[PDB]
Ligand binder design. Sequence first.
Ligand SMILES: Nc1ncnc2c1ncn2[C@@H]1O[C@H](COP(=O)(O)OP(=O)(O)OC[C@H]2O[C@H](O)[C@H](O)[C@@H]2O)[C@@H](O)[C@H]1O
Ligand SMILES: [Zn+2]
Length: 285
Amino acid sequence: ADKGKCGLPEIFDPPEELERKVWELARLVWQSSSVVFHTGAGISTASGIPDFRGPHGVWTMEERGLAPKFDTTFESARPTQTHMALVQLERVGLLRFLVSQNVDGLHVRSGFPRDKLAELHGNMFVEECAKCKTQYVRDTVVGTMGLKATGRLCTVAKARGLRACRGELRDTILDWEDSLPDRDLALADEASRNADLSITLGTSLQIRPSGNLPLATKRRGGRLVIVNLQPTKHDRHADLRIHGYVDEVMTRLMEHLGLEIPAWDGPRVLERALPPLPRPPTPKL
Ligand SMILES: Nc1ncnc2c1ncn2[C@@H]1O[C@H](COP(=O)(O)OP(=O)(O)OC[C@H]2O[C@H](O)[C@H](O)[C@@H]2O)[C@@H](O)[C@H]1O
Ligand SMILES: [Zn+2]
C-alpha cells in the first residue's frame, strides 16, 4: 500500500568525480575478503524493464495517473552489462553473495549460481510446491502473483521410504501482506553480517527488511558503497556514494579489475557456485 518516495530528481556525479569514485570502488573490491552485492530494479532499466520509484517508475507513473512502459517482455528481456559483470565477479571470487529484490528473473537466467543468490521478493519464472518447497525454474513467466495456485502439480517422484508429492505449485511473487522467504532472508542476513564490503546497485533501499540488509555490514565494521541515480533511504551511512548509470559504473570497474564482461548465450540455470577462476594480480594501491 505505502509505495514510499517516488519520482525524486536524479543526481549525477561530475565526470572527474565519477572516475575517481569508480577507482575507489576498485580499491575497496581489491582489499575486501567478503563482498556482498545488493541489487534492485535500477539494474534492469537498461534492458527495457521500468523500475518502481524512478522518474518513470511503475509506482511513480501509477501515482501520477500514467502507465509504466515496458520495452520488452520478461521472457525476451536479456541481462544487462551489470548482470553479466556480477556473473564474472562471482566466477573469479570477487563476489561472496548477491541479495536481490528483483522479480524479473534476470540473475538466474544470466547463469548466476542460485546457492549464492537470495531472491527476497520472488522470481516470476519460479514456482514452488506448497508441500515439499521444491522450486521449479521455468522458461516462461508463471502467470500468477501473490503466492497463488498456478494449476500445475509437483512432480518429485518416490524414493526409498518416501512417495510422490503431487503438491500444488504456487508462484513466488510476494504481495504487500506476505512475509519474506525465511531461507533467502536468513542467508541474505548471514552474508550481509559477515561482509567487509556491501555494494548496492540500482535500489532506493526504501523496502524493509531488504533495504536495511546492507547496514548489517556497516554496524559490524564493514564498508558500504551505494550506486544509484536517485538519493536512497540510507545515503548517510554510505562510505562511498556513486551517482551514475550502473552499466557505466560496472563497465569502468571491470576494466579497472582487468576483467572481461562474459557473453550471455541464452537463459541458463546454474544451481551451485564453482571454486574461483584465475584473476589478474592486485595493484599496490
Ligand atoms: N541505470 C541505472 N543506474 C543507476 N541507478 C538507476 C538506474 N535506473 C534506475 N536507477 C535507480 O534505481 C533505483 C530503483 O529503486 P526502486 O525503483 O525503488 O526499486 P527497488 O528495487 O529499490 O524496489 C524495491 C522493491 O519495492 C517494490 O515495491 C518492489 O517490491 C521492489 O522489489 C531508483 O532509485 C532509480 O533512481
Ligand atoms: Zn512437492
